[model samples]
Target chain A: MALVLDGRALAKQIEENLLVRVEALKAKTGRTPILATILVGDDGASATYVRMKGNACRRVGMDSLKIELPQETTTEQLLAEIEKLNANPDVHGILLQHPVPAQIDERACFDAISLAKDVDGVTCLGFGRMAMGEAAYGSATPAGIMTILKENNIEIAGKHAVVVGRSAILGKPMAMMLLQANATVTICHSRTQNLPELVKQADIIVGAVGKAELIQKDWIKQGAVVVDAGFHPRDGGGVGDIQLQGIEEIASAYTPVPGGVGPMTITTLIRQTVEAAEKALG
Target chain B: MALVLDGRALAKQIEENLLVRVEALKAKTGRTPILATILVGDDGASATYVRMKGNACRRVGMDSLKIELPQETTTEQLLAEIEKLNANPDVHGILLQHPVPAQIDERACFDAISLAKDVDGVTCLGFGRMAMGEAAYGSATPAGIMTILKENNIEIAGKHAVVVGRSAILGKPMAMMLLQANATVTICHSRTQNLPELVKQADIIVGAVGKAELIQKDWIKQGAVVVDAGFHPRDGGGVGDIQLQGIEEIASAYTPVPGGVGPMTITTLIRQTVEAAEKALG
Candidate 1:
């Protein structure tokens, strides 16, 4: 059987480490790391995500200041709030939740977040810096994915990694991270032709395509390391971007749908917040 | 026999078009577009590049302001100079000649250039914006490569392109440009294992590795598009990163060693400056 890439277990371990660091930081500076989260809309998913993040911060003995904006908020108002967070010394990391109202200039507000506190890595500055192999906090999900790969001792260098998405926050950053680790990365999206033929050559396949079970089981190479970043609600449980059924028979290791990428995303954010606080305090 | 991708002819055509735009902009705004070039230290190559850029500007009816700095210049001093250029309303484009003294923080200085005037596209913000398919000036050489590909009607989408370098200015940006154009890009560096095998699979090959003729003739797949960004002076003439002696017989299209990528780099810079000037005036 293939080794299960258990993100929940790893996240739990990382949270323990973060808790200790938080205590040390508190004792040293008498201030816990504060993650300022701005949710600009009333999406149930966004609210749950923000709440889960705050809950994670609480569990790690840190502070989270939640700022909820009305759906009718203007881009100027959002920028004003972000500027306030940027100037606030107590705010270690600033996270502006995704899918803000359509009326808002999303990219403008994301770029407005100061680079030092762009823990979510939505800013264009952060994206470019991260891609250039410069020192910057990466987008949480991709950074989390990198952590999972490293913590599991997956051979990244010289591996052919196929990332099946081109999202600004997820797939694009994920490809750059893998490339930085010396993997030969090929990014495929909706426009990609003959993707199955390309996927067959991958030593590592990263499924970030949002569609459920979009990546077929037969496309995965034997003993290939698989990372699925997709999570969709279905009957009884959830399904990921890749078909994980019978994956254990062929794959070397794989991340389970429910407990794989989801946990790491939040854990990575919390870890970066703590690190940012350490730098600020030190 | 392969079709030669002539950069000189393309550059000449672009210059003619740029001259027309420059005249129109001058007529409307009553101010000529100006490029501010900062050259630090006394490298012979850097001097030639800066001079060439100025010469190109003069040819196109635009003005260039050249600022020379000493070997002992500090990062803070350079940034201050760049800030002045950024604030200068006349300066449409800012170009910083590469290979500043070892004492200087080159990346910091490059990043200091304003996004609007980042015509040479060295800033992290520009790189990220370009990578995300947003409006931003791209790094010159890579942007030039894209121009050559498009102007020649060389297919990019769905092609497997292997870029054999990872320099922040050239290879990384080139790969991202190709990715944006819907090509599957694989970036290889010095650390890449079994590079011959990787090269064999490329439908398009971009040689940005600085070594002279580092890419072997046989490694390239037959009828593949080849773009060499390297320019190294040899005994009688110059050699690029790719071997081109018998390339005509095997490759479908190839950029020549001295006259291929070299001319396009400067032309792209000039073009961007004109575009920036027009945008500012409009």
Candidate 2:
């Protein structure tokens, strides 16, 4: 009987807004916003995600340049490609698909991306800047959630938020953003003891833990807003970390797995790309 | 009655143990441990503090060098002095006092100190490194508190801690250190809404707010341990921020600000200097 957060509807709205911006950019600058996608190795899901992202960009009227590299790609070669994208004024954003062959040092590769075009905010420098209260491009998925919260006029200031993950790209940045919004953040990780006790105190509970159904209905504090960021493969298909049916009964408001936190991520990617292009043009 | 956390008694224990190490170090290197102190301006309190720190270093059989600069010193001149200290092989630790003249860019001056000799940990480089989970020197006062806590076998891990200040050197680094110790940290500044409610939840409460008597006895939960880092002027004399009489009635344990955090701060400076010397030697 709880309200669904409805990310699909919100993501479409963001995409529509970006479409208008992209058209204006095209009319004024004679060039469309461009996102350079570097797909390394051949992780099937990564390939599919990158392709879908490119198609989404095209849908939003932004140009998408796909660069596929062999599995034998060296760290140096990948960095060189990123450097090339960084120097090219045409490429406004760069998205390097993760899990780039076990051989490549992921952190070093992410660091090579220029901060201006780091729309995904995967770089340590970006995270560090964001952590210390400097303005920088934020992680796409977490950034998208923030946009949704703001767009819906959800009041987060002075609220106690419990984040159930600690990834630099997502949880850490989310905590920093929430802190900036004047929300007290408690970042719980795998090592955190008394998970339910912490969750019970939250006005907002963010379950970003990868393990499916790690947080239960009973763990949801009464009248607390919930955001589940876990997308995992299940027997039927793909499912989020939450047991949706169970949590829906307890949570005041929650997002569905398939439609929630999915499209907003892709939408934000294009939206940020267009914004970056417009800024670059001005 | 509250259990008093006696830092003077604790610091003496540490110094007594360190004397053996100092003797062994001299036997091995044929040179005493050298620490350099750089003060810029004739601020009476600063001069007194620097002199006291130098005297402490000498007491521990560590060689001390003091650089006293006039208030009219330029940023370039200060940077040059720091650079010289950085290059000196005999100088193991370099501490540039805070609050440089209005004309000098303090942050830039702090950054000029080389990381190897930056035992004070005032540089953005050091702060960034510490924030990034790298092995780096932390601020002396907070580091001293941590050393005392460890030496006393205090249970910090997996506890809830409330920090009442947000300064870069003290409160901020203290939170990071507490988090490193597996304590869940909540940092509350002036903007924080529910001050008393949050303070009551702390298993370990750190008062670094500098506002005298801001934390009260009624705000403390049963058996809650307190660490007071506040130093301010009293009626015709020097006194701590805490209303000691009020806290002694309600708290399980507490740090008497002047004799508590003060001794640890100075000892930590010498300890870190020795550590920097070891690192530089290695």
Candidate 3:
């Protein structure tokens, strides 16, 4: 049977487990975990993502710290705000919405988040640590995909995983995460040659190329597990990077575009926040 | 005729260029760039590497600040040494010899090297920056491999590159560097199944498994380029990770064990230190 790797169902189950753990920690410390969300500009898409995260925080008994800044905010001003959160012992995780103002340096701000509270796993240090097989929270989307694979009991070790993208947060980190889990990982992008031929050899396929339906169904092997991290609304009719129209017929298991990777990201952020708090309190 | 990548000759050319640049920078700043090398134990291998780097610095008219500590050095002691170098403006590069005492946390010490002076490119931040296509000195061996490929004009874009190993410094960064250059990169390690089959499809192969002749000659495709990073004396009688005896017969280009990637490490370290000092002085 082709399992429709249900991200929504698993996300709810994870939050349910997180609820119990949060209560136990709160009882001991008399304080819930705190997640600080920083939104640099008033971009509609970025705003929605931050609000979604903040709502997820409250549901899991974690306080959400919303830090809004003007569109004209200087890098120095944002770094100063980041400094405040870094020093505040109560904040267990820091989430800085990507695509800051055109002038602001996002990489510097992303790295400013301390290792202990880099719940979003955007910090270079955190990514490097995770990539090097050390202790660090993984980037949200890839970490969630790893969680799904583990929870589904998909054999990651010794498998050939082809990750179709190379963005720092999604594709790059996804490749490293799979490599850490003992997968022989191949990273493919727009510049990659023989994309279809390479995709056919993967035991596990991760669609992260940011192009809708770029990974054709025929290219995927019969028993491959697909994890699509790309979400495009207008490109190719709101479909994911993979051609999922006839995927279930041949694939052993696959994450649905809308309900798959979407649910795991915010859930992972909240869960990581709770875990960071527990680690500090313990 | 298949070209021997000649890392020794290339490394010499690079050092000669650096020798001129080092003198030019010294004249402007009235002081040579200094490299701070920290060696925490008296291991024969580590001691040799440190001395080699220090000697390279002198060859390029750079100063080498050797900071050798006791075998019983604590993580704090090593960290303090790194901190001093980070603060010293004249110190253009900082290198902490790998495999510190059993008691020390090497990763922490490596990360403490200022991003500006991570000459050996061991810092997590440096690796992440380089991985994300930012400005950062690459890990020595991998960067040297990239140099070999570039100097020889072996086409990287649209090529299939398979890197055999996953160490933080060697295979991992090599994969990222190749990916950035538009090569579809596959990272296979000891845990990888189907290693030979995967490597068979590669247009370029890199061996960094730290074993001798583990990657067979047959696995490499005809016309493929091989860059081996491993160096084992006793394990396989002074051979490299790749089976190099007959590599020239089939491969279009290859790097030799004793004269290939080996010559580039210390040379890259010296060059990066000079560049770091030049950037700071300007």
Candidate 4:
């Protein structure tokens, strides 16, 4: 039987380590690490998510300065606010909630965040650094996935791994990371044909598709390790990209919707935020 | 039954383009694009390549600046010289002869070249940019292969491409370029198992393994488009990674060892150098 890959357990271990580092940082700088979270507009989901992130900072003895912008905010106003924050040395980490007013070019907004202050790892420069296999700050989700995989002692070398998504945040970076680990990676996206045939060939399957129940249990070959990165709220319950009940029977081990990769993502974000703070002072 | 992939033909086409651009650049900037060719030792092959590169530059209306140092030159000394070139605004591009003296760490010397002046696309930053799907000047040989494929209207997207070799300059970056084109890329190296099985799955086979005749006639999948990037002297004549006589009947098209990808490699180098110079001025 294959061992269960426990993301929650692994996330807690990383958080515990970050807590210790936070204490050392506070003692040295004589000021707590501060993360500025700018949430644009009033999406209920975005608000709740930002609140949870702020709570994570509090739990780790870090500070959060939340800024809320109106839905009708113009691009120039938003950029001016970002520039102000860029000049603030006290604000070591900046997390700008995306999908800002539809009028705003989100990429230009993300580019404006100073690399040193970019705690969420959203900038192209940070991704470029990671993509080059150099020391990098952002790219937390991919980093978190690899951390959980490594913590679980999953041997990646020479493994045939398939990543079924091509998003900039997760799918593409995950494929590159797996390749760096010496795994022969096949990145299958929406245009990919014979998805099931390719899925069966993988020793490990990473499901990053946002579509709920997109990955069928029958498609998963026996003993394949699955990671579900999609979360959808069903009428009766929240469902993951994978139909977990049937997949649990076939998959050697898998992450469930509620307590799996989701928890690790924000936790990793906070971890990166604290990292940004420490780096700024140095 | 199949056509030969004429590297010489494609290279000649590109060289003509480069000649026109070089003439235009010299007329506009009042300075002929100069490539500094640095050789560490008096190795016969190395000297011969340097001479050939100088002659090739002349054909395109560019100048080749030669710098010869003994094989016993220290890493510190070489780095100092490269720094001087980096500060020299007049030098357009610098090509350090590879396989430098056995005593020097090649990677260190390669990295020491300023990023702004890295014309050969050898820096990790250049490789990283290509890997990240960002705008980057790619390695000439791989870039040349791509130019030919695009000009030939070969379908790259959704195709299965197998690249054998994992060198930083050739294999790894080549896979990145193919991946950027949306191909399902598989990279195999010396440690790979069932290499033949992998090659058979390829719609496009890039034979980059330096070993002569390592990829034989029977190893190819029928109608596969093959590009051999290997050139080494064998018992009777120059032997390539692929057996030309054997693969000619099976492959849809193939590049010959001596006349194939070799010429395009240096021509692309000169083309990119001119482009780089233009970008720097702009």
What is each model's TM-score for chain A?
A: 0.97, 0.94, 0.94, 0.93
Candidate 1 stretches with Cα past 4 Å from truth are: A24-32, A70-74, A88-90, A279-282, B27-30, B71-77, B279-282
For A1-282, candidate 3 gives per-residue lDDT tens digits of 578888899999999989889989999889878899999887997898899899888887878988999999998999999999999988888999888999898888888889898999998878888887778888999999999888988999999999988888899999999999999999998888688998999999999877778888999999899888877777545678899988888789999988899889889888888889999876
lDDT per residue for candidate 1 within A1-282, as digits (tens), equals: 988999999999999999999999999989889999999879987898899999999999998999999999999999999999999999999999898999999988989999899888888889999987688989999899999999999999989899999888899999999998999788888877778988988989999988999999999999999999999888999999999999999799899999999999999999989989999998
The lowest-lDDT stretch of 10 consecutive residues in candidate 3 chain A is A230-239
- Global lDDT of each model? 0.92, 0.80, 0.88, 0.78
Shift of residue A256 alpha carbon in model 1, Å: 2.0
Report model 2's chain A TM-score: 0.94
Listed in order, the DockQ scores are: 0.64, 0.28, 0.78, 0.32
For every model shown, what is its TM-score relative to the native structure?
0.93, 0.78, 0.92, 0.88
Q: Which lDDT value does model 3 have at B87?
A: 91
Of the two candidates 2 and 4, the one with more favorable lDDT, higher being better, is 2
**Which residue pairs clash within candidate 3?**
none
lDDT of 2 by residue, A127-233 (tens): 65565566677888888888767776777888888888866567766776676677777777776777788888888888888888788767778888888887887
Tens digits of per-residue lDDT, candidate 4, B1-282, equal 656667778877878878988888788878878888889986887788788778888888988788999989989989988888888787777787777888886766766777666777776657755665666677777887887677777788887788888676788778778878887777777756567877887888898888987987777889888888988876777877887876667888777778878777787777877777777653
Off by over 4 Å in 3: A25-32, A40-45, A68-91, A101-104, A233-238, A279-282, B70-72, B87-90, B101-103, B233-238, B280-282
Answer with 1 or 4, whichever has the higher lDDT. Answer: 1
Write model 4 residue lDDT over A150-222, tens digit each, in one string: 8777777887778888776777778767877877777777766678877877777888888988987778879
Q: Which of the numbered candidates is closest to the native, going by highest DockQ?
A: 3
Candidate 4 chain B: worst-modelled 10 consecutive residues by lDDT = B125-134
